[PDB]
Amino acid sequence: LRIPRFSQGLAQDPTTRRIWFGIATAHDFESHDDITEGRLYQNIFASHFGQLAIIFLWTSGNLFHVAWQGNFEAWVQDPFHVRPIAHAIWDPHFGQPAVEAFTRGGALGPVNNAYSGVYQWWYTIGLRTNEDLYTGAIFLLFLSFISLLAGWLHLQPKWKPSVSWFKNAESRLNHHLSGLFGVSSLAWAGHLVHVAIPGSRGEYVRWNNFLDVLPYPQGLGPLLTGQWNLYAQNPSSSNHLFGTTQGAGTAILTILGGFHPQTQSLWLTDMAHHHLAIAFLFLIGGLMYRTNFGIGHSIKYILEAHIPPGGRLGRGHKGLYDTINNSIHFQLGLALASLGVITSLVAQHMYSLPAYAFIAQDFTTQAALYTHHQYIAGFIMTGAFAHGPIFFIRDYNPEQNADNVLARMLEHKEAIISHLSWASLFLGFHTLGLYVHNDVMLAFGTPEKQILIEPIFAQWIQSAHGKTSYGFDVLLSSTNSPALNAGRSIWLPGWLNAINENSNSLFLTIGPGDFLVHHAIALGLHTTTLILVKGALDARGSKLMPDKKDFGYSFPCDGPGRGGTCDISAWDDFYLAVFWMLNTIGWVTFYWHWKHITLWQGNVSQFNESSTYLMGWLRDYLWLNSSQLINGYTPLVCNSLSVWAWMFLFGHLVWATGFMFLISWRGYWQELIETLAWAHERTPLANLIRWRDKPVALSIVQARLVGLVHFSVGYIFTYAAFLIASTSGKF
């Protein structure tokens, strides 16, 4: 009859509630009318092609604007002293001083300074001209199309796959490991040795000459013969100019380690070697499980056989195979969990080990990328912990999982939750305690009475890596051991050079200030996990509500009876954790940024002393770096940072607006609207017009969402405005 068509019960709502909820439930296929397992699987599979189409289109546009409105070529010729251009600006509201200030990077008009690091990435892989960027944009536009073509193709009956096909896991793993991971990594190693590395050295190897240009002097033979060391005889000289055939070796596969001294980035030869190396593990690994040829494993049976006799895990993992394969919420929560972990692994390894040329010197880009991925990694983790409860409520079969490791979690759930409470309470009581204590004496003017615990455990790890600072005498920095000498030159000499670099971010110096914050982050992790698992383990029910299983993942509440039951659903527990997640990542990004902007200014001394007490954070970090930001537009002038000053205030406004939906609740607003409904009816010249949807206050759950969205958007945008401007201003 009406929108939403997928929900008839929703479509018959006379109020404005239907339009809202029609949007918020469009992707929840399992709740749609007359849903079948068949319809469920190839809706996702088709929605999957839709997502790919967006990514390729989004990436196509990036290659387009940089080629059309970005200099790039000007950037290539002097990567150190030119600012990359994202795209042009066209805004009628712009005053002349605006068009003025934003004209940068040698552009004919006002543009935006790119902080995505696409310039360094594209330059490192071998893109040298705008023409190259266009061909990529066209190719991605074409890739974006065939994704839609495949999406449309499998929605057709003559090409649609069976659910069982989707549930054949043994073969999907075998291909994804061997093909999706292995081959793609192998193919990339080819681009590196054919284009990236030779493009780095100085030769332009492209489609019209790649067929006639050897990647290596010696033939393809040495690989096939067996002697592969010949691919490492002649590496690039330390004093090598990128994009210049100066001090350029011939080797296409090395393990030098450390950084290319001019670019401060990892060697391309190391990477061409890396991907080639990992491709194999993936390639062999993608041949573990059984398919149609008579050899291979059975995942189920391996899970079945893993039962420790004599307790204490019970039935082990029996029936666990079918619980996962029949539940795509388990799979997603399992996927987000793994993806979320390596998302941070990207953030941690990309600032410590820069992969692209001239990215380490672009301090605004480095800060942005780390902060970017940590918040991305943050939200992903809350999703892995969100599809968890949904699995328990919608897809969990208690009987089929009788006394296995999964079912043993629900029967001692009070143990996991209470100790998470203890660990959270422990960390909080002392981390906050040590902080406040330190502020007291500095107020009292006696900073020599502070509790400054030296992170001696972590410093012991640093010395174990090769850092000759401190007197620890541990592996890779000791007097006699099998570890360092296993270096056998190769990685160690180039890498040990890199670790004792006082300039790079590769293993910075840490102290008492680094101790307190790491505990704050540990507090943030534990508490967030406490909230999320408690929502998961009590998703099917508690003692306050034993039949929570019968109400679904998201419901408003259970009423004011039995003392009150506000925010008792597993959905709300997620919604509460999102707050704690933002706080945690907030502390992480604060800690990363401040320690770096003090390092970049050549003044780590200020961080080492001000980070030990909380007033230092608010003043020497928050207050101190805001001056240039908040003067983006002044009652006297107008700078290029005016965008960020405005967005800074914008973020504050969205943030505070969420507070309205989180503090004030529905019954007040509904009664207010009822008076407004009366008004409109009794007002002449306005009676002629009537609404087609009954005006009602937002729902209890909707408001918690809407408020959280405001809270999260303002949270991000405010810090984004500050992270960029404060860093861009000083550089």
Partner 1 sequence: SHSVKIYDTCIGCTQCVRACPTDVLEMIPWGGCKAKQIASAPRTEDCVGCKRCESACPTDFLSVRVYLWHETTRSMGLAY
Partner 2 sequence: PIGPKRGAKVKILRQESYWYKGTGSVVTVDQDPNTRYPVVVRFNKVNYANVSTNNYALDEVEE
Partner 3 sequence: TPPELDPNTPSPIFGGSTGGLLRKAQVEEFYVITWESPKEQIFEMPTGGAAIMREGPNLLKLARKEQCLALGTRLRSKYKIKYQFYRVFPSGEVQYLHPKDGVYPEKVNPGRQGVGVNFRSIGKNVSPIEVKFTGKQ
Q: Site residues for partner 1, window 355-374 (CB under 8 A)?
A: none
638 is in an annotated binding site: no
Strand duo 85-88 + 111-113: pairing: antiparallel
Does position 696 interact with partner 1 (CB under 8 A)? The reply is: yes
CB contact at 8 A, 100 and 124: no
* 130-153 and 37-68 helices, crossing angle to 10°: 170
Does position 81 interact with partner 2 (CB under 8 A)? The reply is: no
How many residues touch ligand CLA (CB under 6 A)? Answer: 65
Does position 656 interact with ligand CLA (CB under 6 A)? The reply is: yes
Q: Which does 555 bind (CB under 5 to 8 A by kind): ligand PQN, partner 2, partner 1, none?
A: partner 1
Cα angle for residues 89, 90, 96 (degrees, 5° grid): 90
Q: Site residues for partner 1, window 12-51 (CB under 8 A)?
A: 12-15, 17
Does position 562 interact with partner 2 (CB under 8 A)? The reply is: yes
Residue whose C-beta lies closest to ligand CLA = 383
Does position 89 interact with ligand CLA (CB under 6 A)? The reply is: yes
Q: Which does 562 bind (CB under 5 to 8 A by kind): partner 1, partner 3, ligand PQN, none?
A: partner 1
Burial 5-36 (b: 16+ CB within 10 A, else e): ebbeebeebeebbbebbbeebeeebeebeeee
Tell me the per-residue interface mask from 388 to 417 with partner 3, x by CB under 8 A, - otherwise.
------x-xxx-------------------
**Residue from 48, 191, 408, 437 in contact with ligand CLA (CB under 6 A):** 48
Q: Which two tokens stand for residue 480?
A: 């006699």
- For 98-157, give the DSSP string: HHHHT--TT-SS-EEE--S-HHHHHHHHT--SHHHHHHHHHHHHHHHHHHHHHHHHTTST
Q: Alpha-carbon Rg of the chain, whole angstroms?
A: 29
CB of 681 to partner 3, least distance (A): 5
Residue 618 falls in which region: left (phi positive, over 0), alpha (psi -120 to 50) or beta: alpha
**Residue from 445, 563, 602, 684 in contact with partner 2 (CB under 8 A):** 563
Does position 311 interact with partner 2 (CB under 8 A)? The reply is: no
- For 593-641, give the DSSP string: HHHHHHHHTT-HHHHHHHTTSHHHHIIIIIITTSHHHHTSB-SS-B-TT
Q: Which does 543 bind (CB under 5 to 8 A by kind): ligand CLA, partner 3, partner 2, none?
A: partner 2
- What does the chain come to in residues? 731
Does position 431 interact with ligand CLA (CB under 6 A)? The reply is: no
Does position 602 interact with partner 1 (CB under 8 A)? The reply is: no
- Within 246-287, strands assigned E span 259-260, 265-266
557 is in an annotated binding site: yes
The backbone torsions φ and ψ at residue 456, rounded to the nearest 5 degrees and listed phi first, read -70, -25
CB contact at 8 A, 384 and 610: no
Q: Which two tokens stand for residue 37?
A: 């397992």
CB of 550 to partner 3, least distance (A): 6
Q: Can you list the alpha helix ranges (DSSP code H) found in 354-406? A: 363-384, 387-390
CB of 11 to ligand PQN, least distance (A): 18
669 is in an annotated binding site: yes
For residue 553, give Cα distances in angstroms to 389, 407, 701: 7, 19, 12
Does position 561 interact with partner 2 (CB under 8 A)? The reply is: yes
566 is in an annotated binding site: yes
- Distance, first Cα to last Cα, the chain: 58
Residues annotated in the binding site, as ranges?
557, 566, 652, 660, 668-669
Interface residue list for ligand CLA (CB under 6 A):
23-28, 45, 48, 51-52, 89-91, 93, 98, 112, 165-166, 168, 171-172, 175-176, 179-181, 184, 332, 336, 379-380, 382-383, 386, 390, 423, 426-427, 453, 455-458, 460, 514-515, 518, 522, 553-554, 571, 574, 642-643, 646, 653, 656-657, 659-660, 663-664, 672, 709, 713
- Kindly list the residues in this chain that would bind partner 2 in the complex (CB under 8 A): 543-544, 546-547, 561-563
Per the annotation, where are the binding residues for [4Fe-4S] cluster?
A: 557, 566
